[PDB]
Amino acid sequence: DEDLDTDNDNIPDSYERNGYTIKDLIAVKWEDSFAEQGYKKYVSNYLESNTAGDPYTDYEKASGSFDKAIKTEARDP
Amino acid sequence: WEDSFAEQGYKKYVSNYLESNTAGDPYTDYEKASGSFDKAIKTEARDP
Amino acid sequence: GTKNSSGQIVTEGNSWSDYISQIDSISASIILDTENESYERRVTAKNLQDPEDKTPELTIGEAIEKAFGATKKDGLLYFNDIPIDESCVELIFDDNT
Structure with missing residues (x-):
C-alpha cells in the first residue's frame, strides 16, 4: 500500500485520504x-x-x- | 625498549x-x- | 574548529553565525555575576506544548548545578568554595520570567 509516485517517503493513501x-x-x-x-x-x-x-x-x-527556530505553526505542510 | x-x-x-x-x-x-616529517625541526622536538 | 579524518582541524567556511539563532530558540539564558568575573550560559529546555519531543528536563537548582561546575556540599551548592544557595545570593528576574 505504498504506491506513492513521488518519493516523499510516506503512505500515499495517508497523503490523499483522511490524514496521518x-x-x-x-x-x-x-x-x-x-x-x-x-x-x-x-x-x-x-x-x-x-x-x-x-x-x-x-x-x-x-x-x-529541520530548523529549530521555525515557529511551530509552520510545522503542518 | x-x-x-x-x-x-x-x-x-x-x-x-x-x-x-x-x-x-x-x-x-x-x-x-x-x-x-620535517627536517628543520630541532631534534629535541622529536619525543612526543 | 572541527577535525576531519585526516587528523588535523580546518577552520574555513564554518561560521558561528548560523548556529546563533537555533540555540536561542531552545534555551534558557542564565548569567552569574561575581565580584570580578561574569559568566553567561545557555542551558537546554523542554517544551511542554508538543508531546512528540523527548528532551530530559530538570529544575533551576539542578540547572545551576549542571551549567556551572557546581559541587553539592551538604545540601548547599558551592562554586570554587563560594556558597550559592537560594538564600545567600541575590536573584534578578525580568518581568515575563
Whole structure:
C-alpha cells in the first residue's frame, strides 16, 4: 500500500485520504483518539513533493528536525 | 625498549593510547617519533 | 574548529553565525555575576506544548548545578568554595520570567 509516485517517503493513501500523524519518527494512521494525546492531523499531497513550495519537503517539515527556530505553526505542510 | 639501548644512542619515548595527537602538534605520534616529517625541526622536538 | 579524518582541524567556511539563532530558540539564558568575573550560559529546555519531543528536563537548582561546575556540599551548592544557595545570593528576574 505504498504506491506513492513521488518519493516523499510516506503512505500515499495517508497523503490523499483522511490524514496521518508523524509519531516516533514514523508515519502512523490518524486515530481519532489522538487529539487528547496532543497530536494533530496533517493532510498532504502525493503527486508532488514540495506541497507548499517551501525549500523543505513534507517529511522534512512534519517531523520537526529541520530548523529549530521555525515557529511551530509552520510545522503542518 | 631494551635497557641495553642507551649505549647504542637510542632513547626511550612514552606516549598515550586514548588519543592520537598526544601533544596537540599538527604531527601525530608515529609521524613525530620516526623523524621523516620535517627536517628543520630541532631534534629535541622529536619525543612526543 | 572541527577535525576531519585526516587528523588535523580546518577552520574555513564554518561560521558561528548560523548556529546563533537555533540555540536561542531552545534555551534558557542564565548569567552569574561575581565580584570580578561574569559568566553567561545557555542551558537546554523542554517544551511542554508538543508531546512528540523527548528532551530530559530538570529544575533551576539542578540547572545551576549542571551549567556551572557546581559541587553539592551538604545540601548547599558551592562554586570554587563560594556558597550559592537560594538564600545567600541575590536573584534578578525580568518581568515575563
